[PDB]
Amino acid sequence: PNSILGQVGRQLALIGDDINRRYD
Amino acid sequence: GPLGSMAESELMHIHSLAEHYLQYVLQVPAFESAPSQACRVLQRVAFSVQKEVEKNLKSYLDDFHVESIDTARIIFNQVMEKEFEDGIINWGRIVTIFAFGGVLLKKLKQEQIALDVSAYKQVSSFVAEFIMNNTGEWIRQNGGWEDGFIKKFEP
Known part of the structure; x- marks a missing residue:
């Protein structure tokens, strides 16, 4: 199963990609 | 010197950006x-990203124990x-690196009550170093800070 820091990092990626799309 | 002029300038820029951002986050007195x-x-x-991180991941971050600079480094690298x-x-994603740096430094201040200057310097x-090692070439290839980053976020 997943780990807390796994989840944290994957959520950072989601936000990063969302921001990349937001300013496009 | 060791890295050559261009790479050295790039590393210095990223360091400057990071310490300036973290000082802003922490509300270290500007001059x-x-x-x-x-x-x-x-x-x-x-x-603004840091606040989005802090809101969205609150349940995780409430359970972080950032008691030292070394713990902050370990958590940073694993994340x-x-x-x-x-x-x-x-x-x-590059922006999220600075932002999560800020998150960890805020948690460190929370645990220590007061930081000393050494703490924000070490985290920055x-x-x-992470940003330069993992994304420095990408940054160069994508217009750098004046041509890429500024044009992305403030056209």
């Missing part, structure tokens, strides 16, 4: 300075590994 467009833009965008697992680099350093 009528005039940030570059890159600094100002990074500060505006990374700060960065998980974030960049898929190999994708873009400006949005490991953040900056």
